[PDB]
Design a protein around this nucleic acid. Structure first.
Lengths: 122, 86, 89, 86
RNA sequence: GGAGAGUUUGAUCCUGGCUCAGGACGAACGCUGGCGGCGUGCCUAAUACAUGCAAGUCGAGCGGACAGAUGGGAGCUUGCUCCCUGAUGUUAGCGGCGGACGGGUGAGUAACACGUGGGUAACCUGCCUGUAAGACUGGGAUAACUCCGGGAAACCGGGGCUAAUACCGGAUGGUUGUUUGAACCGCAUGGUUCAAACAUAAAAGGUGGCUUCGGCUACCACUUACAGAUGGACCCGCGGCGCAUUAGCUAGUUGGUGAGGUAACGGCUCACCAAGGCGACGAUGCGUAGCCGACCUGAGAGGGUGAUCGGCCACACUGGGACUGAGACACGGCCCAGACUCCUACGGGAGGCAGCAGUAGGGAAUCUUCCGCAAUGGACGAAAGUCUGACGGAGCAACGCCGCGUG
RNA sequence: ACCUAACCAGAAAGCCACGGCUAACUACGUGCCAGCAGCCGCGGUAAUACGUAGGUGGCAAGCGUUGUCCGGAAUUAUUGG
RNA sequence: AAGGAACUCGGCAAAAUGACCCCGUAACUUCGGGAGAAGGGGUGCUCUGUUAGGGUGCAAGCCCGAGAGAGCCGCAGUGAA
């Protein structure tokens, strides 16, 4: 439920603070992207010492939404803050740590590095 | 990686427990004789002065008192207890 | 207490103590209470003269020697004669 | 058997508005370590007027007491010279 | 105990700067390079760290536990094991002390931080002297030890059992607090000394040796009271720095009263009251910086630096916090948070080289991952001893100083 | 460590400077080119200044360059403008 | 719901902010402002408590009441306009 122009706060030590969406990547196409969905983005605000700066267009990956993650087993994951982790052209992240809890559905994507770098994968 | 006196760490835990029991018992007894000095009670004033006195010297005479602070506490408590009973 | 013991001094080839009275646990080449004595190990051999007029006040005013301080101050006639100070006990 | 010589220099009366502490600082001389010529200067001080019987502008100098307040060190001695007013 | 010379001019003198001769380093670089002795060697990034050692000790405190001379009985092998007693030796845990000294580094801080000089009728002091009293009567615990358990580990939990120099009642004790009677003297606070009532401890320890086996005694201990000594704590005078292109600052601030607090006065912290206080004699603010004995230089006044040795302060990955203790807000102790690394069974754990070396970075720039408690100082001991990267030494570098040589 | 005996002169000397300040001089090459330099300043075919060679002078298991501090600096002056 | 100006010539429109008390408030200036700048915190009830203190009254009596300490309960304390 993260369509175009949705300011997602970042969840790593890559330098960034607020990420602005541009286009969800799937297809012609779509207008929503729930959890684990790669987005083309920019960065509106940043911690001042960072390799990814303000005004730089680097892709990202959702981790958490206030929208639900719907596991196929009845239970629903839904966080209270939106998220991003920033990717450099392959699914190894540019970040170093990944803050906060993390939706476990990323592991069923190809993000097996991103799961290992993140504390509470639930 | 503590080389020696890790058992000093465990002795600081157990000694901190027993010392907290005696010292906190002294503070609670001092509030007890102070509470008995709160109201105008004669016989509880003198016997409770004996209670906070005996527990006071028994606390300051071993460990964390030590001497001058105990004389300050028993002195002011003696002033209030001597006030409420003459 | 103040353990009146030795203290190194001299070159790196030969050390010669000059055993001033010192604190309980001061540094080795550091602060001392009130220096009285000097006694090199060598030269020739072991010639050192001590105070005994204030050093009796130091050894009687609450103190003790080291090993070499006890053998030296027992050799110069100060520990025994101080014991004759305590012989009027 | 007296050994302690806690003594204070006699100075004028600067102000007594601070209640129970009428403090004023007296002036001594100094030599300038490069040039040589004499240059004096004041040195302020609070003075704990216990009776509060000081006069502002009356030269009375008192000796230095213990730490009595936040930077009030000298006790009073006597009103040595009264103020001449009117 | 002090030396000047060059350089403005077509020539001259003044005035005026600019440079050189001299010394010095914690130097580096260029060339070269025999030795010895004595000192010196991360000054830049308090940057991060692989690996080893840097604080242990007490069997003469404790209850074990194991081995075991020597002795005992069995089976066989004519030499062995099996089960007991036991000199003896060893140590995991409890407890006492020591990790607050020692070692390192200048990150901080422009004031009580340092130096100096007073003061403390405002403090405290374990260990050690010396004095003199005491060490009486009891209690219930608990780690060890096992039986189950949960954990990947780190590790926790629960049930049974024990002891001490562990802890905890009572008597006794003033001196340790509260009330009174005084006596003497001060620095406002008040201090010193005498008496009379209410409270406050003790390892009966251990070691030996002796004995009548009741007990005796010495030594090393335990407590209490005193003074001594060693240490730190506090307050204050004075001194040591660039800036006015920093003149405002301050509201727990200035002062009172009251209460609480600490070893202790104190807005130290709070309640209530008042409106104070600091400043051209430089407040505040920016900057920089550990300070001193001292070192280098100067004829001297002065100018510069705070290496190595010492004295004090500070800090211990960053930032708080408190416990144990006499004493820390603790460098190789804990709790929390942040950073960075390592482990992971993803539930959670582990770390602090500004100790000695040592590696990477930084840079022009700085070394051996060595020997030993023989000395001196420590620590623990009854001592024997153990630990001691302090120290005593060594290894490298012409890095400095001095001596000798290459005839 | 130091002592004693033997052995062999055998293995053990370089760095900077040579106009002035400042001890220390001539030749070849170069010809405002390459260069030096602390300041003064040299070098445009006779260079006591650039390199090279002999010699000299300083110093010595060391010698120069640079960094910083003091003096010279009476160029912060109280001494002393 | 989730996202918030991507709708649109244009935040049109709606949503939002708002009452007192207190803290605090910049550039700029014509020196008055700006400035309700900005940005924040408190409020409901019970008791202490015929509070402190005022107005009024001879007392009785009412009114007008800051400020605080304890405590209550709610998602919510100018609970609404």
């Amino acid at each position: 439920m993260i369509q175009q122009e949705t300011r997602l706060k970042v969840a790593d030590n890559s330098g960034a603070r607020e990420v602005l969406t541009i286009k969800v990547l799937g297809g012609s196409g779509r207008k929503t992207a729930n959890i684990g969905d790669v987005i083309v983005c920019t960065v509106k605000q940043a911690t001042p010492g960072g390799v990814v700066k303000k005004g730089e267009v680097v892709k990202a990956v959702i981790v958490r939404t206030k929208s639900g993650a719907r596991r196929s087993d009845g239970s629903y994951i839904s966080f209270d803050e939106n998220a991003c982790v920033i990717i450099r052209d392959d699914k190894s992240p540019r970040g170093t740590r990944i803050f906060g809890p993390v939706a476990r559905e990323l592991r069923e994507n190809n993000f097996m590095k991103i799961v290992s770098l993140a504390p509470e994968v639930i | 990686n503590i080389k020696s006196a890790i058992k000093r760490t465990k002795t600081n835990n157990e000694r901190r427990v027993h010392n907290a029991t005696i010292k906190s018992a002294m503070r609670t007894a001092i509030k007890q004789v102070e509470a008995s000095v709160a109201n105008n009670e004669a016989d509880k004033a003198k016997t409770a002065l004996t209670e906070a006195a005996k527990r006071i010297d028994k606390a300051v005479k071993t460990g964390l008192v030590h001497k001058n602070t105990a004389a300050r506490y028993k002195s002011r408590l003696a002033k209030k207890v001597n006030g409420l009973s003459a | 207490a103040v353990k009146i013991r030795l203290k190194r001094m001299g070159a790196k080839k030969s050390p010669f103590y000059r055993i001033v009275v010192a604190d309980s646990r001061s540094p080795r080449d550091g602060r001392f209470i009130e220096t009285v004595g000097t006694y090199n190990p060598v030269a020739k051999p072991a010639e050192v003269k001590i105070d005994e007029e204030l050093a009796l006040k130091w050894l009687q005013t609450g103190a003790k020697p080291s090993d070499t301080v006890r053998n030296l101050f027992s050799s110069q006639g100060i520990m025994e004669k101080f014991h004759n100070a305590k012989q009027g006990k | 058997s007296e050994r302690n010589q806690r003594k204070v220099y006699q100075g004028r009366v600067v102000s007594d508005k601070m209640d129970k502490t009428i403090t004023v600082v007296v002036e001594t001389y100094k030599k300038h370590t490069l040039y040589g010529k004499r240059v004096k200067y004041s040195k302020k001080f609070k003075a704990h007027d216990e009776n509060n019987q000081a006069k502002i502008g009356d030269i009375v100098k008192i000796m230095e007491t213990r730490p009595l307040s936040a930077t009030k060190r000298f006790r009073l001695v006597e009103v040595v010279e009264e103020a001449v007013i009117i």
